[PDB]
C-alpha cells in the first residue's frame, strides 16, 4: 500500500490541478474571438497564453519545484510548457468529435481550426492520435496530475543545472505513480509503461511543434499576433 | 488660390486617411472584449495596437515619408504614434457624451474606462479637454488629415537624422494647410494658429502619457497584457 508522504503528494498535486484548471471554461470569452489568413491564431494564442499562466501556477505547487532555483524553474517551464499544455488539454478532448470542446461550439476546436493558426498535419495528426490514445488510457485524476508533474520535472531538459535534485523529485513522483497504479488501479498492470510511452510521444510532439513555431514566429506579421508571455516561454532566448 | 501640387497632396492625404480609418468600427469585435484590476487594459491595448497599424499605413502614404530612411521612419513613428492616435480619435469623439463612441455602447469609452487601463486624471482630464477643444474647431477633413501628417513629420523628435529633409516635407505641408484655410475655410482667420497650439498640447499629452506608460509597462503583470506592436512602438529600445 501507499505512504502518507506519497498520499500527501497526490493530494497536493490534485488540489493544485483543481486550482489551475477551470472546468467551466468561462474565462475563454476574454480571449480574442475565434474566426473561421491564419484567422484562428489570435484566439489560440490567447488560449495558449492563458494556459501557460495555468501551468506556471500548477508548477509552483508541485512539492519541491519552488525550492529549485529560478533558473531551473524557468528552464523546466520553457522546455516543458508545450507538453503540459498538450497533456492537460486531454481533459477537454472528446473521442466522439475527435476534438477539444470547451463549452459552446465557439470554443470547439477541430484539426482545421488549428490549421488556421499556422500548423500542419505533420503536427496535428500525431497530436490528435496522441490525444485519442491518451484518452483511451482512462487515467484517474491522480494519474493525470502525477504524469503532468513528472513531465514537468524531467531533468534531461536543456538549460537544467541541478540534474540530481530534479531527478530526485521526479523519481519520488514516479514511485508515487507506480505504487498508485499497483494498489489503486484495477487491471492497470500495463499502465505505467504506457504512460511513460506517452511522455516519449510528448517529446516528439514538442520537437515538431517547436519547428513549426520557429517557422511562425520568424514572420513578424504572425508573431505580432502572439502574446508577450507566449513569446517569452516558447522563445529561444534563455 | 491653391496649386495642383498642394491639391494633389491634399487628395493623397485624404485618400490615405480614408484607407486607414474604418467608420464602421466593425473590426473592434476582434479585440479582447471590454470589461467594467485594470479590466479595460486588454481591450484598450488591442484598440491601440490596431490603431498603430493604421497610423503606419497612413504614414506610408504621406508624400515623401516612404522616401525617408527606415531609421527616420521608425523614429518619427515611435515619437509621434501616440499623438496621431490622440488626434485621429477625435473622429469618434462626442461633445454630447464627452467620450469616444465607436458603434455600440460596448465600444463607448468614457474617462472611467481608461482609468481601468492604468491611467490617471492627470492624463485623462487634459486629454478630454484637448478632444473637446479640437472638436469645437470643426476642422474640415482636409485640415484634420493635414494636421496628422504635419504632426507626424515634426523633425524635432529624438532619434531623427535628416532634420532638413523632414523639415522640408513638414514645411510644404504647412504651406498647403495655411493656403487651404486662407482660400477654403470661411472665418478661418484664426484657425492655423489654433491648430498649431493643438500640436503643442499634443506634446504635453505625449509627455504625460509616456510617464504613465513607463509606470505601467514596468510592471510585468500589466505589460503582459500589452501587444508585441504596442511594446515595440512605445518601447524605449530605439
Amino acid at each position: 500500500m501507499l505512504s502518507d508522504e506519497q498520499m500527501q503528494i497526490i493530494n497536493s498535486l490534485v488540489e493544485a490541478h483543481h486550482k489551475t484548471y477551470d472546468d467551466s471554461y468561462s474565462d475563454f470569452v476574454r480571449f480574442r474571438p475565434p474566426v473561421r489568413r491564419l484567422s484562428m491564431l489570435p484566439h489560440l494564442a490567447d488560449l495558449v497564453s492563458y494556459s501557460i499562466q495555468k501551468v506556471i501556477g500548477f508548477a509552483k505547487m508541485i512539492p519541491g519545484f519552488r525550492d529549485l532555483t529560478a533558473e531551473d524553474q524557468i528552464a523546466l517551464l520553457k522546455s516543458s510548457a508545450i507538453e503540459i499544455i498538450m497533456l492537460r488539454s486531454n481533459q477537454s478532448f472528446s473521442l466522439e468529435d475527435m476534438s477539444w470542446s470547451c463549452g459552446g461550439p465557439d470554443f470547439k476546436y477541430c484539426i482545421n481550426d488549428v490549421t488556421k493558426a499556422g500548423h500542419t498535419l505533420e503536427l496535428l495528426e500525431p497530436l490528435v492520435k496522441f490525444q485519442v490514445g491518451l484518452k483511451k488510457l482512462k487515467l484517474h485524476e491522480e494519474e493525470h496530475v502525477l504524469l503532468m508533474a513528472i513531465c514537468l520535472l524531467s531533468p534531461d531538459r536543456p538549460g537544467v543545472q541541478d540534474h540530481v535534485r530534479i531527478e530526485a523529485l521526479q523519481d519520488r513522483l514516479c514511485d508515487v505513480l507506480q505504487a498508485y497504479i499497483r494498489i489503486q488501479h484495477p487491471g492497470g498492470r500495463l499502465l505505467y509503461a504506457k504512460m511513460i510511452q506517452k511522455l516519449a510521444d510528448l517529446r516528439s510532439l514538442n520537437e515538431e511543434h517547436s519547428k513549426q513555431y520557429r517557422s511562425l514566429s520568424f514572420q513578424p506579421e504572425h508573431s505580432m499576433q502572439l502574446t508577450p508571455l507566449v513569446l517569452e516561454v516558447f522563445g529561444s532566448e534563455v | 488660390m491653391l496649386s495642383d501640387e498642394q491639391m494633389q497632396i491634399i487628395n493623397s492625404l485624404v485618400e490615405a486617411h480614408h484607407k486607414t480609418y474604418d467608420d464602421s468600427y466593425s473590426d473592434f469585435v476582434r479585440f479582447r472584449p471590454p470589461v467594467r484590476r485594470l479590466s479595460m487594459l486588454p481591450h484598450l491595448a488591442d484598440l491601440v495596437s490596431y490603431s498603430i497599424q493604421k497610423v503606419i499605413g497612413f504614414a506610408k502614404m504621406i508624400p515623401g515619408f516612404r522616401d525617408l530612411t527606415a531609421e527616420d521612419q521608425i523614429a518619427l513613428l515611435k515619437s509621434s504614434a501616440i499623438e496621431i492616435i490622440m488626434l485621429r480619435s477625435n473622429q469618434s469623439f462626442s461633445l454630447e457624451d464627452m467620450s469616444w463612441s465607436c458603434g455600440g455602447p460596448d465600444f463607448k469609452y468614457c474617462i472611467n474606462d481608461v482609468t481601468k487601463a492604468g491611467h490617471t486624471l492627470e492624463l485623462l482630464e487634459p486629454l478630454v479637454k484637448f478632444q473637446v477643444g479640437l472638436k469645437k474647431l470643426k476642422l474640415h477633413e482636409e485640415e484634420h488629415v493635414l494636421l496628422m501628417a504635419i504632426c507626424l513629420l515634426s523633425p524635432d523628435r529624438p532619434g531623427v537624422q535628416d532634420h532638413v529633409r523632414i523639415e522640408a516635407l513638414q514645411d510644404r505641408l504647412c504651406d498647403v494647410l495655411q493656403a487651404y484655410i486662407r482660400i477654403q475655410h470661411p472665418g478661418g482667420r484664426l484657425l492655423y494658429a489654433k491648430m498649431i497650439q493643438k500640436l503643442a498640447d499634443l506634446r504635453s499629452l505625449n509627455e504625460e502619457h509616456s510617464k504613465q506608460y513607463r509606470s505601467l509597462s514596468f510592471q510585468p503583470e500589466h505589460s503582459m497584457q500589452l501587444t508585441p506592436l504596442v511594446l515595440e512602438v512605445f518601447g524605449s529600445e530605439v
Binding site: 506556471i56 524557468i74 517551464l77 520553457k78 516561454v233 | -
Partner: peptide
C-alpha cells in the same frame, strides 16, 4: 531576460 516568467513565479 524572462521578465514575465520571473514575475509569475513570485
Amino acid at each position: 531576460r524572462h521578465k514575465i516568467l520571473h514575475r509569475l513565479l513570485q
